[PDB]
Design a protein. Structure first.
Lengths: 68, 70
RNA sequence: GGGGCGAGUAUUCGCGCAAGCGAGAAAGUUAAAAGAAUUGACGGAAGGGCACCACCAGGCGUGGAGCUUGCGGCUUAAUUUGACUCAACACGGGGAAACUCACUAGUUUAAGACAAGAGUAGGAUUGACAGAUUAAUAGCUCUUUCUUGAUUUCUUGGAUGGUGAUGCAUGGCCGUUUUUAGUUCGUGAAUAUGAUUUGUCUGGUUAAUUCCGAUAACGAACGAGAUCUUAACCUGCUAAUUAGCGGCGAGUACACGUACUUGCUAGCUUCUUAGAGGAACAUUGUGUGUCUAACACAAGGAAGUUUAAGGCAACAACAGGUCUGUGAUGUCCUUAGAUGAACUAGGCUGCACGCGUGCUACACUGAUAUAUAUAACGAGUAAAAUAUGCUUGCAUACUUUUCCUCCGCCGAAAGGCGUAGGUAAUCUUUAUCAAUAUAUAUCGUGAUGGGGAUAGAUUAUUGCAAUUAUUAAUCUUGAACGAGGAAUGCCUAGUAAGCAUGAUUCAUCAGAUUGUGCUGACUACGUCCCUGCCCUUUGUACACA
């Protein structure tokens, strides 16, 4: 069987999903077989760029407030 | 796939026949006529490496140098 | 009226011309039969949509012949094995002479941890010349009799290895549904039981649950989009080597500057290379549409089907494939006459036949022979091998060589011998490493100078080894085939088709994959008729559907 446990927000496709996500796989030998472990963490909007500089997200268009 | 068919018994392994205190047959000493070598000594091996007295030749068991009797 | 079959059956009585009607059991057997809703799946029910793995208008074919290659079947000592609609069948990177190797016939080996007992220095055990014996130069075994020194050997446990079984015990990875457009949550409402609904929709629009809008719903999240890589534009910016152009001299010939060779080295970036930027938004005009969301045509422009091609890929699944990729792994087998590891030979390729992917053709819009002109993506350097003292072996430089190979000589050719450069924008070698093309001549509708299967003979190279013929070279031989029946595949622009080439495998071998360039069409600008997938209503006694 498989069991999934989620929380929050996660991305799957595109180039951002390879920058902002951290992934690992491990296995544990129990008495009656092998179990696979798979962890995926999206970093808190923290990713330097290929032209290295702290980026944010390719999906946002905040509009600034006029000075008053 | 099938179990073997054994019609011929096993090839036997090589045992080495044992002689008790064979060295006392290599040197013997009388009262007169002191110690006398009974086999003969090698040529390029450190002294005391004796060689076999075969039916028609002499054989060194350590370097395999063969000298033909005639 | 009192769970379902047995059963409105048996027996008996009344009534009837008969058919039959009205009252009406028991033994035995059974865990459910039965009512109404909900979600899905299915329909030879009704509507609506999408798509050259669907069709329409067409191109080129395949299916028919010879042959190359994979799969069944037969055969064999063995012809090792997994996968069988799409989604098995030039797939397992699977082009096997040995090795690989898992199959057939033989023969060796210990590279059997550790613990306990035995055996033993008055010797546990190891190795071997000669003759026999073996395919064998495995002392494998035997005769014979020397060497060796506690490393080993025998017994009982206990480990170890295994291309041995189980993908229906698992991990990981991959394929498919599906490259479609889908999936979920908070609060509110339907509740006044519930499984569950709505939000997620009649309509218009888009490649798209993409948008506009209607509205018991108001808002959010993944997927789509955005993002990333390559291509197309820039005489504007930043640069000049292992890139070019230009500048200055000396020549060789011509015409009164042109072509080529050569020594040297003001400046510049068009050509070559590669970093940063910019550029398209449907801009402007005209039409259709609720004048919204959008669509079509024209002008400009390098570019107006999101400009072209790709990579990534939600929720949920399949008893899909793989334990023959793995010091990923559970269980079961086996472990000295081994199912461990090797060595010799053989098989995987055996041929009355059936099926899939392909290569070569059936000629004149051609075949043969000469000549002219012209690409893009690539790759490249512990062993054996060449030289003194010694009788096919030893000691010797790791001083040369092993990969791509220019050039010179020899040979019809394949190839051989001698010598450069290159660990590479520097050399091979690319202001060019191909073939379709183009020009001129011969042949002349004749299975023909089309086609090139099948056979004979000789010669080279790789390799320890070429027989069942590794590959290549020369002469000879010269089969079917005259456009392919029923069926069926791919495809909309620098695309189909035709034409060749670099890499992967690789000691030697491509009719195979995976990339690259060269020549370059016809037909549509649609539809729901066939096939497939999706949505709505509807029926259901289906839910392994
Ligand atoms: Mg995308
Ligand atoms: Mg009853
Ligand atoms: Mg029922
Ligand atoms: Mg079809
Ligand atoms: Mg048609
Ligand atoms: Mg053809
Ligand atoms: Mg055929
Ligand atoms: Mg095949
Ligand atoms: Mg086969
Ligand atoms: Mg071969
Ligand atoms: Mg294994
Ligand atoms: Mg499976
Ligand atoms: Mg699996
Ligand atoms: Mg719903
Ligand atoms: Mg330039
Ligand atoms: Mg394995
Ligand atoms: Mg073998
Ligand atoms: Mg085969
Ligand atoms: Mg002929
Ligand atoms: Mg011919
Ligand atoms: Mg292949
Ligand atoms: Mg249809």
């Amino acid at each position: 069987k498989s069991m999934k446990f989620r929380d929050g927000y996660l991305i799957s496709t595109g180039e951002p999903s390879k920058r902002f996500v951290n992934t690992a796989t491990r296995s544990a030998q129990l008495k009656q077989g092998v179990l696979g472990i798979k962890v995926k963490i999206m970093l808190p909007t923290a990713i330097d760029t290929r032209t290295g500089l702290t980026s944010i997200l390719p999906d946002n268009i905040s509009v600034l407030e006029p000075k008053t | 796939k099938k179990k073997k068919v054994y019609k011929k018994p096993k090839k036997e392994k090589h045992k080495k026949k044992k002689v008790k205190l064979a060295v006392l047959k290599f040197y013997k000493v009388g009262d007169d006529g002191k110690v006398f070598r009974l086999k003969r000594q090698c040529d390029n091996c450190a002294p005391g490496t004796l060689m076999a007295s075969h039916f028609d030749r002499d054989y060194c068991g350590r370097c395999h140098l063969t000298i033909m009797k005639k």
